[PDB]
Design a protein around this nucleic acid. Structure first.
Lengths: 138, 36, 175, 133, 123
RNA sequence: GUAUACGUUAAGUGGAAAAGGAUGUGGAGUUGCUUAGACAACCAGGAUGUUGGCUUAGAAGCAGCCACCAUUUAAAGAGUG
């Protein structure tokens, strides 16, 4: 379960998610990965769920590279209060994921094991996913 | 069983499309699935 | 590569009509059949063999050519040889019975089971268990066999009720 | 017909020859002596014997050769095979007794030549875990 | 444990009676005693003690007898191991009774030392 | 304008949303085979060394672990259910 232990500011603007991925577009650590097709906030609970779902089915094999990190906090005002009167308290941490970005990286297993592990990870994520692999021109 | 995720459970399952509805028939009657 | 190209040899002695708007009457020693067809297909008959030809490669025509050729094969098989669907009534107290043309089944209900056969379809009961239905059309004998099976479906724990030839019911364990 | 591999030195009691001949409808003890008469000179080995069946309750048994597994146990000396063949090479059998074992299997095996037979029993020797040398 | 060692032979008799029942009911259900085929049977015909032969499920009773026999032979292994361990424990405890029933002082001190050495024992 | 030409859809989509599921259909592009005869269907072989080996009574291809070979050959895996 992933969170920064110290931040410069505890309350930040929610930002915008226009455009493609700025970086982390190509798979370059593992052999196979998930490429994002839509943009939404990914909570660290979802990241933990996808990581356990991959790691359990890969009980024998290589390690998992988590390419995204939930650095941006989101604030949640308490329920049943009026609008305004100050910004609410921070509740959790999300990672801003753009389309084209690689989320998790797997090497050291077979093809179908990696495909099924990425499918089990993708069924926990709130975004449309696809299977990508390393290209060697090169 | 009626579910919107009609999938072949075993190797003997066969996917058919009766009446515009995706269905799975099998020798095992527990694998009979319909949607819609 | 498909059933619409193989030849269908007919035995002696049958004959086939080629009436307008695609109506086919088939004469033979064991009955008479007449069905209405679709106007989009052109049918031609050669010497002692029947052929059906497609007009195009569309999916409706690709289905209809095969269905027409298959049911013509069913007609020429049933008009000269016929079709039998054999049934077995398995149980200590099961009996098919005969009273004229009426068919009586001694199924374990509190009321005696009676089923009325249609014209041209006959049922014979030779023995304790085995019963044979006789007819010249596959559709009619299939409907009759379904109507016989409808009064008592076979239950999976023990072999009871109406059963065909070789076909396994799923065995279940009771307590 | 029910074929089975009957040990020579333990054909008297109700094991293997008992229930096989019992369902055929014949007394086992009246044929155990006939089994032990023809299995005397190959005693200590398990011999497959064909058991033909007739309608008039008369039975004539056509004996076969000893198996290539049992004959390789005779040629080597070890009774039980290794846990993993071609991983624990427990024994080595020279080619002359291999040729003798292949030559014993003439009247039952349909091999045209003895070279084909020694190539077969080379393959059976590889299943034994025994080095063919 | 010697009681279970006699239950071993009891369950061997149970396996004999179940194998008697297994073809059965060759004989009538009751005890299915001495059921053997005269010919074309390997007449094991073992002598058996005949409980009435169960039951509603006629094969699972003989199969239950055969399972009791497998548990009995695993018991033949494990209870002999436990008897060996129990005589070792009784010898050690009789020795401890002897060493407590008086001696030295310094001897008791080094007995404590040896015991604590025997066994490692968080570190 | 019941207009022209080329296609697409068969659900009343048009004329209300998703994750996900699916032998729907029209296209584009690879790849194994194919009239020396292709994928299926129907007639036959579907084997002996061989119950291939430790194991459990019994693993006889079809509990488990297993190098996984050799023939008669037009063909057979010490075997997919």
């Amino acid at each position: 379960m992933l969170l920064p232990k110290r931040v410069k500011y505890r309350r930040e603007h929610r930002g915008k998610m226009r455009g493609r991925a700025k970086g982390g577009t190509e798979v370059h650590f593992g052999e196979f990965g998930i490429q994002a097709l839509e943009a939404s906030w990914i909570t660290n609970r979802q990241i933990e769920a996808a990581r356990i779902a991959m790691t359990r089915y890969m009980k024998r094999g290589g390690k998992v590279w988590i390419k995204i990190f939930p650095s941006k906090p989101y604030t949640a005002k308490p329920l049943e209060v009026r609008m305004g009167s100050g910004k609410g308290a921070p509740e959790g941490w999300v990672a801003v994921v753009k389309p084209g970005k690689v989320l998790f990286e797997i090497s050291g297993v077979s093809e179908e094991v990696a495909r099924e592990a990425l499918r089990l990870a993708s069924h926990k994520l709130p975004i449309k996913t696809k299977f990508v692999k390393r290209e060697e021109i090169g | 069983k009626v579910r919107p995720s009609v999938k072949p459970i075993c190797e003997k399952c066969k996917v058919i499309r009766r009446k515009g509805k995706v269905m799975v028939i099998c020798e095992n009657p527990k694998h009979k699935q319909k949607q819609g | 590569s498909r059933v619409g190209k193989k030849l269908l040899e007919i035995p002696s002695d049958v004959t086939v009509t080629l009436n307008d708007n695609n109506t086919v009457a088939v004469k033979g020693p064991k009955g008479e059949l007449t069905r209405t067809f679709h106007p989009d297909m052109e049918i031609k008959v050669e010497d002692n063999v029947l052929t059906v030809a497609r007009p195009s490669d569309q999916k409706e025509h690709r289905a209809l050519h095969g269905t027409t050729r298959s049911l013509l094969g069913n007609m020429v098989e049933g008009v000269s040889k016929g079709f039998e669907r054999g049934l077995e009534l398995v149980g200590v107290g099961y009996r098919a019975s005969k009273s004229g043309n009426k068919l009586v089944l001694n199924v374990g209900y509190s009321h005696p089971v009676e089923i009325v056969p249609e014209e041209g379809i006959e049922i014979e009961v030779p023995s304790q268990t085995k019963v044979v239905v006789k007819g010249t059309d596959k559709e009619r004998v299939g409907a009759i066999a379904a109507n016989i099976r409808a009064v008592r479906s076979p239950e999976p724990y023990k072999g009871k009720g109406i059963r065909y030839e070789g076909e396994v019911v799923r065995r279940k364990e009771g307590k | 017909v029910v074929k089975l591999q009957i040990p020579a030195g333990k054909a008297n009691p109700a094991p293997p020859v008992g229930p096989a001949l019992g369902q055929a409808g014949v007394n086992i003890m009246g044929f155990c002596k006939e089994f032990n008469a023809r299995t005397a000179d190959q005693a200590g080995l398990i011999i497959p014997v064909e058991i033909s069946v007739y309608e008039d309750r008369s039975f004539t048994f056509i004996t076969k050769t000893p198996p290539a597994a049992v004959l390789l146990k005779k040629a080597a000396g070890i009774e039980s095979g290794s846990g993993e063949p071609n991983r624990n090479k427990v024994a080595t059998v020279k080619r002359d007794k291999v040729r003798e074992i292949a030559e014993t299997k003439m009247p039952d095996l349909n091999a045209a030549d003895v070279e084909a037979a020694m190539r077969m029993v080379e393959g059976t020797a590889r299943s034994m875990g025994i080095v063919i040398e | 444990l010697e009681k279970t060692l006699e239950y071993s032979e009891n369950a061997k008799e149970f396996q004999l009676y179940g194998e008697l029942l297994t073809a059965n009911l060759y004989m009538l259900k009751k005890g299915d005693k001495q059921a053997e085929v005269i010919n074309y049977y390997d007449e094991e015909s073992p002598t058996i003690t005949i409980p009435l032969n169960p039951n509603k499920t006629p094969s699972e009773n003989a199969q239950a007898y055969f399972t009791k026999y497998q548990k009995a032979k695993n018991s033949v292994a494990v209870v002999e191991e436990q008897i060996r361990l129990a005589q070792e424990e009784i010898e050690y405890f009789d020795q401890l009774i002897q060493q407590l029933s008086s001696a030295s002082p310094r001897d008791i001190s080094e007995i404590r030392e040896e015991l604590v050495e025997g066994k490692y024992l968080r570190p």
